[PDB]
Amino acid sequence: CDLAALPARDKLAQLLTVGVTDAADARAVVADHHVGGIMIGSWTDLSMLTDGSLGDIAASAAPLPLAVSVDEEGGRVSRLASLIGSQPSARELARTKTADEVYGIALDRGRKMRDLGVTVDFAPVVDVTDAAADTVIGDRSFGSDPAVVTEYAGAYARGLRDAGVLPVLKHFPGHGHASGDSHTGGVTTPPLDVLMGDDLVPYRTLTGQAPVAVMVGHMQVPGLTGSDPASLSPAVYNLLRSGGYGGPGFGGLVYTDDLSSMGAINQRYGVADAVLRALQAGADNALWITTAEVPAVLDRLEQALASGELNQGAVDASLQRNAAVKGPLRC
Ligand code: NA
Numbered sequence: 001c002d003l004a005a006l007p008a009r010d011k012l013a014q015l016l017t018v019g020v021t022d023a024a025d026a027r028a029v030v031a032d033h034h035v036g037g038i039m040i041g042s043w044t045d046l047s048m049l050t051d052g053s054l055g056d057i058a059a060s061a062a063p064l065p066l067a068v069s070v071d072e073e074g075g076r077v078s079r080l081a082s083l084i085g086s087q088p089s090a091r092e093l094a095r096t097k098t099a100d101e102v103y104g105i106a107l108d109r110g111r112k113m114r115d116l117g118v119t120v121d122f123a124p125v126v127d128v129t130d131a132a133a134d135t136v137i138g139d140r141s142f143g144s145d146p147a148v149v150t151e152y153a154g155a156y157a158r159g160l161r162d163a164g165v166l167p168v169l170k171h172f173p174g175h176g177h178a179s180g181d182s183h184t185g186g187v188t189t190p191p192l193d194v195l196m197g198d199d200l201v202p203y204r205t206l207t208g209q210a211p212v213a214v215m216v217g218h219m220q221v222p223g224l225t226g227s228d229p230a231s232l233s234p235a236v237y238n239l240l241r242s243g244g245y246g247g248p249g250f251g252g253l254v255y256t257d258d259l260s261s262m263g264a265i266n267q268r269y270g271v272a273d274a275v276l277r278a279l280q281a282g283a284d285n286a287l288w289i290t291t292a293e294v295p296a297v298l299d300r301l302e303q304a305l306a307s308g309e310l311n312q313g314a315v316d317a318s319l320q321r322n323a324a325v326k327g328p329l330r331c
Contacts, residue, residue: 001331003323004316006063010034011319012301014064015279017255019289020044023053029291030057030066033298036322037067037120041079041289049083049116058117065327067166069120069287072113075139084112089139090125090156094148099155106159113165119326120166122215122255124153126202127176136181146201154206161211166325169206171217171257173230173245174199182218182229182257182264192223196246204247207240211325213253214240216283218264229264231256232274237282253284253321260288272300280310284318 006014017037020026022045026038040046048054058066071077075089087093087109093102106124113121125140128149133139142152157167174195178187189195207214216236218229225233243249259265259274269277271293275286279301304310323329 001063001329003319003329006319008305009298009302010063011315012298012305013294014322015285015315015318016275016294016297017067017069017285017287018291018294020291023048023051023057025291026054027057029294030061033294034062035291035294036064037069037285037287039287039289040068040070040118043289044079046080046083049080049118054117062330064323064329067119067322067326068117069122070113070118071123072109072118072121073123073125073140074109076134077140080113080116080118083116084109089133090142090152091133091139093156094142094152099151102152103155103159106156107163108159110160110163110165114163118165120168120213121160122168122170123160124156124167124169125171126150126153126169126206127171127174128199128202129176131176136178136183137176141176146198150202150205153202154209157206157209157212161209166211166213166253168213168215168255169203170215171219172203172214172240173216173219173221173224173236175217175219178217178219183262185263185267186229187219187264189219189221192221195221195224200245200247203245203250207250207252208248210252213255213325214250215255215257215287216240217257218262229268231259231265231283232269232277232281234281241282251321253325254282255285255287256283258287258289260290260293272297276300276304276310279314279318280304282314284321 014036019039074087130144160167
């Protein structure tokens with residue numbers, strides 16, 4: 001069989017990653033809708049990772065293998081800690097460990113994630129900040145110095161990668177100096193010309209170390225996105241694809257941050273509209289944290305194809321990128 005010959009709706013479902021509550025929720029969304037990815041979060045019953053159910057669902061996934069993602073950064077964001085042990089925050093690692101030690105920590109934890117069926121970790125954070133530890137980014141950042149972030153997040157990404165986990169650099173083009181918490185409402189970064197010399201620095205080297213993905217956040221960026229969240233602005237994706245951000249143009253997989261529960265998005269757009277806008281803007285993978293909306297979202301995406309709101313080429317390019325980080329088609 002042939003990737004380009006899949007039914008339109010299954011091509012579209014491959015561009016979605018959705019949070020699941022338990023095995024029954026994951027089993028239904030994968031079999032009924034063929035979503036490309038499921039996400040494990042704080043809302044997830046983790047017994048599915050140890051009782052054989054994730055393995056069973058993943059093995060019957062078709063036409064592409066299932067991607068299984070999680071926020072496993074360490075410190076305050078460590079959804080698998082009960083199973084893989086806790087790790088100090090990114091900031092504490094940078095303060096107490098060498099970069100080689102951080103590589104080893106990420107490698108060890110990556111293998112522990114693989115054992116549980118995880119394929120994608122939404123880490124490392126490459127945001128640069130000096131904010132108080134328990135703020136939106138805060139201690140999730142490896143440091144206030146972009147060169148330190150590059151060294152330490154680079155090591156963390158390399159460890160995950162060597163374990164065979166896809167690392168995802170976040171939150172592009174930089175949440176570290178944003179005006180507030182995008183979970184609760186709209187936020188603004190410093191202008192692009194400021195980001196160019198600071199927040200964007202880590203991406204210049206880290207996006208070229210493959211396999212790697214990037215996640216775009218919901219901040220508004222002056223001089224780039226205007227009043228649009230970055231995840232929903234074509235300018236953001238053009239910046240990443242063209243090399244305009246100061247590094248080589250990035251051709252790999254690009255996720256959005258959570259499109260449903262986060263106020264920066266949901267106060268302006270419902271889930272289906274937000275997913276459409278993201279894929280129009282240039283995301284390869286639209287992420288949100290529930291499965292209920294999937295059939296309505298797929299309905300809206302098919303309509304956008306018909307109306308030309310969404311170009312067939314955008315879908316095909318992103319379908320290829322999603323397939324490129326997975327195993328073979330299942331015919
Ligand atoms: Na696309």
